Amino acid sequence: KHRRKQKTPKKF
Amino acid sequence: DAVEERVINEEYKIWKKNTPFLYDLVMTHALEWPSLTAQWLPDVTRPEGKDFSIHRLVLGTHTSDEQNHLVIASVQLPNKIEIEIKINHEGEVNRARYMPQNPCIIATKTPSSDVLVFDYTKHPSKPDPSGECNPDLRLRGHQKEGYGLSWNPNLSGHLLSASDDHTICLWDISAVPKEGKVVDAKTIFTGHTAVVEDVSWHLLHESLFGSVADDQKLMIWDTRSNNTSKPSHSVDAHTAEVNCLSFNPYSEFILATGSADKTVALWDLRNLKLKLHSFESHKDEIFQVQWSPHNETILASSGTDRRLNVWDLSKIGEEQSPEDAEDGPPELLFIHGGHTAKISDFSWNPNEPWVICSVSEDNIMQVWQMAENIYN
């Protein structure tokens, strides 16, 4: 199953 | 060679060219960090002699560094999106939900497994530069992080939480002053044998709530029962993990579940041995499902296919054009294809009908409303 939250989020 | 990014970019272009014919409102805003949660605040202020009202959203941050925040943003809706309050949060905000009886109180789910309770009127508009998280209440009882979080709308201060530790925690903070103390769970429900992905109180009967888990099961619980290891009803809901559930606010017997089997299942509490309907269109695992607060037959679902489907159960079984049948089933009202990444959460605006805020993994927050001629 897909992770509920991504491993490494990125800053904008 | 995962150029799904090629498919995404091209679909987005075609969507962006078709925003005018399918939408009455499209607002796009890139956040500093992506948000895993989104929920409109129930208050709305309409200034005199102006064409817009101010709505508020409960957001969070998902950062890789150690500067996470619980966020409250303001939105100017017709008839500009800016951040208003940033509160220091220990770890990323898995989910944030306000208390219906007091929207100043906001519960959050943290990676440390703790549930935090914030009174955002007791925090400065600028976050504490020291980096300390000072929650007005720290709710303890979970071993792992989670995502199910539900305030009881008929029993003030009764909060449920679903975690990856296979348990559901219930807290009664109604008699606890919010002065930063640690409150242990009043009750822990252990019926599931896998990650409990979501939990939700029944919106009318104060003793009933539902839970969905990685064991593909939907469970209906009664707090009046003395057995906390076995629910009232256990339903083989899906052919894969179930990530979300949502009770109909106008139909006390109806609820919906979304699953990794790419479907949304309709349920009737009076006979849970038969799945009422199976909504099919989604191309990947579904993370969130929410009933419309204005129409009892309107329901929406979002997930890892980067789409948000809006369903109309009153259109189930309708005869349709063969070409129309290619676009989807008749009960499929609308496909929002504005996001280019996985949608983490979405919220129906409770004061503006058909307005939806959805947040995605690419820091994108979108406030949109499908064209009136589509639903009307």
**DSSP track, B194-206:** S-EEEEEE-SS-T
Residues facing B244 on adjacent strands:
B258
Taking the Cβ of residue A11 and every Cβ of chain B, the question of whether any pair is shorter than 8 Å is answered with yes
Question: Would you call B36 and A5 a contact, using CB atoms and an 8 Å cutoff?
Answer: yes
Spatial neighbors of B269 by CB under 8 A, at least 6 apart, are: B220, B252, B253, B254, B255
Spatial neighbors of B293 by CB under 8 A, at least 6 apart, are: B249, B348, B350
Report the alpha-carbon distance of residue B290 to residue B260 in Å, rounded: 16
Task: Report DSSP state, residue B327.
Answer: H
Instruction: Give the pair of three-digit tokens for residue B149.
Output: 């979080």
Enumerate long-range contacts of B69-76, CB under 8 Å, 24 or more apart. B69/B93, B69/B127, B70/B96, B70/B106, B70/B108, B70/B118, B70/B120, B71/B35, B72/B41, B72/B120, B73/B365, B75/B27, B75/B357, B75/B367, B76/B52
What's the half-sphere exposure (Cβ side, CA atoms, 13 Å) at B174?
13
Taking the Cβ of residue B32 and every Cβ of chain A, the question of whether any pair is shorter than 8 Å is answered with yes
**What does the CA dihedral B159, B304, A5, B22 come to, rounded to 10 degrees?**
-70
Three-state secondary structure call for residue B50: coil
User: Mutate which of A4, A6, A8 to test chain B, going by most B C-beta atoms within 10 A?
Assistant: A4
For residues B111 and B91, the answer to whether their CB atoms sit within 8 Å is yes
For residues B125 and B135, the answer to whether their CB atoms sit within 8 Å is no
Report the alpha-carbon distance of residue B50 to residue B54 in Å, rounded: 11
Taking the Cβ of residue B194 and every Cβ of chain A, the question of whether any pair is shorter than 8 Å is answered with no
Report the alpha-carbon distance of residue B43 to residue B50 in Å, rounded: 17
Instruction: Give the pair of three-digit tokens for residue B237.
Output: 């809901």
Report the alpha-carbon distance of residue B259 to residue B245 in Å, rounded: 9
Report the alpha-carbon distance of residue B153 to residue B156 in Å, rounded: 7
Spatial neighbors of B1 by CB under 8 A, at least 6 apart, are: none
Q: How far is CA B307 from CA B140, B262, B301, B337, B344, in A?
A: 35, 12, 8, 5, 11
Task: Report DSSP state, residue B285.
Answer: -
